[PDB]
Structures are given as C-alpha cells and as structure tokens.
Design an enzyme around this catalytic site. Structure first.
Site, short mmCIF file in Angstrom:
data_model
loop_
_atom_site.label_atom_id
_atom_site.label_comp_id
_atom_site.label_asym_id
_atom_site.label_seq_id
_atom_site.Cartn_x
_atom_site.Cartn_y
_atom_site.Cartn_z
N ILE A 11 37.45 25.85 41.59
CA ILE A 11 38.70 25.97 40.84
C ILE A 11 39.79 26.84 41.45
O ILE A 11 40.91 26.87 40.94
CB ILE A 11 38.43 26.49 39.40
CG1 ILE A 11 37.61 27.78 39.44
CG2 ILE A 11 37.67 25.45 38.60
CD1 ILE A 11 37.25 28.31 38.06
N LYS A 13 41.02 29.77 45.04
CA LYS A 13 40.73 30.66 46.16
C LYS A 13 41.86 31.68 46.33
O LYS A 13 43.00 31.32 46.62
CB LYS A 13 40.58 29.87 47.46
CG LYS A 13 40.18 30.73 48.64
CD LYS A 13 40.06 29.91 49.91
CE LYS A 13 39.47 30.74 51.04
NZ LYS A 13 40.20 32.04 51.20
N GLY A 14 41.51 32.95 46.12
CA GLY A 14 42.47 34.03 46.25
C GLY A 14 42.51 34.57 47.66
O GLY A 14 42.24 33.84 48.62
N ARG A 15 42.83 35.85 47.81
CA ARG A 15 42.89 36.46 49.13
C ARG A 15 41.52 36.50 49.78
O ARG A 15 41.37 36.27 50.98
CB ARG A 15 43.45 37.88 49.05
CG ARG A 15 44.88 37.96 48.56
CD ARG A 15 45.40 39.38 48.65
NE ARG A 15 44.47 40.31 48.01
CZ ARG A 15 44.19 40.33 46.71
NH1 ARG A 15 44.76 39.46 45.90
NH2 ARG A 15 43.32 41.22 46.23
N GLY A 17 37.27 35.37 49.17
CA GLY A 17 36.34 34.56 48.41
C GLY A 17 36.96 33.38 47.71
O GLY A 17 38.15 33.09 47.84
N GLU A 18 36.13 32.69 46.93
CA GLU A 18 36.57 31.53 46.19
C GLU A 18 36.00 31.54 44.77
O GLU A 18 34.90 32.03 44.54
CB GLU A 18 36.14 30.26 46.93
CG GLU A 18 34.68 30.21 47.31
CD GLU A 18 34.34 28.98 48.16
OE1 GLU A 18 35.00 27.94 47.98
OE2 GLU A 18 33.41 29.07 49.00
N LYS A 32 33.22 34.20 41.20
CA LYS A 32 33.95 34.42 42.44
C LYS A 32 32.90 34.74 43.50
O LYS A 32 32.15 35.71 43.37
CB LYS A 32 34.96 35.58 42.32
CG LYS A 32 35.83 35.76 43.56
CD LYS A 32 36.80 36.94 43.46
CE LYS A 32 38.08 36.58 42.74
NZ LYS A 32 39.00 37.76 42.68
N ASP A 133 49.15 43.77 43.28
CA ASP A 133 49.30 42.35 43.62
C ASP A 133 49.51 41.51 42.37
O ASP A 133 48.92 40.44 42.22
CB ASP A 133 48.09 41.83 44.41
CG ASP A 133 48.36 40.48 45.06
OD1 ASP A 133 49.56 40.11 45.20
OD2 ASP A 133 47.39 39.79 45.46
C1 LIG Z 1 35.90 39.20 38.68
C2 LIG Z 1 36.13 37.72 38.72
C3 LIG Z 1 35.06 36.83 38.51
C4 LIG Z 1 35.33 35.44 38.55
C5 LIG Z 1 36.65 34.97 38.80
C6 LIG Z 1 37.68 35.93 39.00
C7 LIG Z 1 39.08 35.56 39.26
C8 LIG Z 1 39.91 34.55 38.63
C9 LIG Z 1 39.67 33.57 37.56
C10 LIG Z 1 38.98 33.90 36.36
C11 LIG Z 1 38.80 32.89 35.38
C12 LIG Z 1 39.28 31.59 35.58
N1 LIG Z 1 39.10 30.62 34.62
C13 LIG Z 1 39.60 29.36 34.87
C14 LIG Z 1 40.28 29.02 36.05
C15 LIG Z 1 40.46 30.04 37.03
C16 LIG Z 1 39.97 31.35 36.82
N2 LIG Z 1 40.16 32.31 37.78
C17 LIG Z 1 41.13 34.65 39.29
N3 LIG Z 1 41.01 35.65 40.21
N4 LIG Z 1 39.79 36.22 40.22
N5 LIG Z 1 37.42 37.29 38.95
#
Ligand SMILES: Cc1cccc(C2=C(c3ccc4ncccc4n3)CNN2)n1
Length: 299
Positions: A11, A13-15, A17-18, A32, A133
C-alpha cells in the site's frame, strides 16, 4: 505478533521501508517492513512511538515493533492501526470536502501536532517532540473524517531539563525557509517546532483548496505546484521560498466564507520567514476549535 500477521497488499513506500496491509486474527493492520540494513531507521521510529504517553487520537496508533525471520533473511517490522482512506494526500485527490469536513481535517491535524509539541510534565511524563517531515502524504484520514499523524522516523525529542535534543532531512517541498537556507539553529528545539508549523500551513492550504462551496472548488495541488518542478531540489525551493519570498496563492473565492477566511489567515501566520513569528500548534487548535463550535460539527 508479526509471526501471526499475513501480508495481503502493498500500500505504500515512504523514505525508508515499505507499508503493507496485513491481517491479524482477521483484523486489518498496517505493517511497515525494513531490511536488515535499515535497522537504524526501524529502531528510531520504534523508539519515537514507544515514547511515554505518546498515544493520542490524532497520532497513528502504534501496535508493536518486531522481527520476523523467513528462513533466509530477517525482516524488521512496525505494526500499526490500518486506515482505509489512506494518506491525506490520497484523500484530497479523490474527494472534495464541505466546510465541516475541512475544519475536522485541519483541527484534528493541529490537535495531533499540538500533542507532539507539548511536553507533559509528571512522573510518567511525555517529552516535547518535533516531527521534521510533516506533509499531506504523512498524515492519514480515519473513517470518522479526522486525521492522525504518521511517519515519526525523523522526529526529535526535547529534554527541557537541559534544553537539548535526544539526537537537512525531510521533504524538500515542505522544508521551512530557515531549513532551505540552512540558517536554522539545530541546537534550538523550538526551531524544529516552528518549522513544523510552516509545513502544517502548507497542508492547510491543500485541504482548503478542496473545500467545495456551492459546488465550487479548486483542483488538488501540492504546495508550490505553480513554481517548482516535481520532486524539487533544495536550490529550486530556496530560490522561490527564500529569495523570491513566495508562498502558495490564496484564492479569492476563500473570502466568500468565514471558514476559509479563518483558514487563510492561519496559513499566512504559518508562512512567516522567521519561525519566531509563526503561530503555535496550540494557538491554531484553539482557533479552529472555536470556529468549529460555530458552524456546528463533531470535533
Ligand atoms: C509505525 C507504522 C506501522 C505501519 C505503517 C506505518 C505508516 C503509514 C501508514 C499507516 C496506516 C495506513 N493505513 C492505510 C494505508 C496506508 C497506511 N500507511 C504511513 N507511514 N508509516 N507506520
């Protein structure tokens, strides 16, 4: 924990991990995943989320950090609540919002940021924290129309005792002026809070544009979409924000609504070149709270 979670769909990908949509005991959760070589980033984000008294309705709900060895390599996991709508970025691109809706998104975001920035004194106290950020892609919209902040990996914690941080980065487009020109005092925690406000003002600009009044509204755009190329460099942003001293344009349409007027005013007071002149997250929350009680809608 991670041992019983089943990944189902990629779903985001940030800076680092995914992010995946996983299933835990039948319940949807967000996972993540980091590689072994990304342990520092994994560790730091787990560290921030485990900060005493961090939980808040406007902050992504942290479930746990864990490791999972598939037999060949080990994956470093962070698990959190799942929010179907996804990022504020995706939400605003797909939908337009009503006055009440805009206010809920803005207020919830400000409340979330105020919590982070606010130090909670006490035995089980919470240190002040700056995000570093903030942006529409790092905020998530919950089923109830409220926002929660995520991606705390770059956050810094303040030790008021000696006024020091526990430790340029971030998204160039949202970098505050002092960051773009690197004049910011890295030793001053307050400077990180003020830089967060600048970014939140940009986010408020993104939301407001989608506020559909009488069927009228602007199309979705990232801040400075009319001044810099996609994925802009620090230099490109600096020339526009620091030298030419430009900010996101405030539509005239926004004057035909008290709600948009209040929002527009908050934006300007967030974009001051000097961080010390900007409003505080708490002040913003208070203003939006009162504006909310006016129209009449769930906070
Ligand atoms: C600490 C953590 C665990 C899992 C995901 C994330 C995270 C994001 C996240 C969280 C929930 C979501 N629900 C639906 C779609 C995208 C999401 N992204 C976005 N950036 N980091 N952070």
């Amino acid at each position: 924990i991670a041992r019983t979670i089943v990944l189902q769909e990629s779903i985001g990908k940030g800076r680092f991990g995914e992010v995946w949509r996983g299933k835990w005991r039948g319940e949807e959760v967000a996972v993540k995943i980091f590689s072994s070589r990304e342990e520092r980033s994994w560790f730091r984000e787990a560290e921030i989320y485990q900060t005493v008294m961090l939980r808040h309705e406007n902050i992504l709900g942290f479930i746990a950090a864990d490791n999972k060895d598939n037999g060949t390599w080990t994956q470093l996991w962070l698990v959190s609540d799942y929010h179907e709508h996804g990022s504020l970025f995706d939400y605003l691109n797909r939908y337009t919002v009503t006055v009440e809706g805009m206010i809920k998104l803005a207020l919830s975001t400000a409340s979330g940021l105020a919590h982070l920035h606010m130090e909670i004194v006490g035995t089980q106290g919470k240190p002040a924290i700056a995000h570093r950020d903030l942006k529409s892609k790092n905020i998530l919209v919950k089923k109830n129309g409220t926002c929660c902040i995520a991606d705390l990996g770059l956050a810094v914690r303040h030790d008021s005792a000696t006024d020091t941080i526990d430790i340029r980065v971030g998204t160039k487009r949202y970098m505050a002026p002092e960051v773009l020109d690197d004049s910011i005092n890295m030793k001053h925690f307050e400077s990180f809070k003020r830089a967060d406000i600048y970014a939140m003002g940009l986010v408020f600009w993104e939301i407001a544009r989608r506020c559909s009044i009488g069927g009228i509204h602007e199309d979705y755009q990232l801040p400075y979409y009319d001044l810099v190329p996609s994925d802009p460099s620090v230099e490109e942003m600096r020339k526009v924000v620091c030298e030419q001293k430009l900010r996101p344009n405030i539509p005239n349409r926004w004057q035909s609504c008290e709600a948009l007027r209040v929002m527009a005013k908050i934006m300007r007071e967030c974009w001051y070149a000097n961080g010390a002149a900007r409003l505080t997250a708490l002040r913003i929350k208070k203003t939006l709270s009162q504006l909310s009680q006016q129209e009449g809608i769930k906070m």
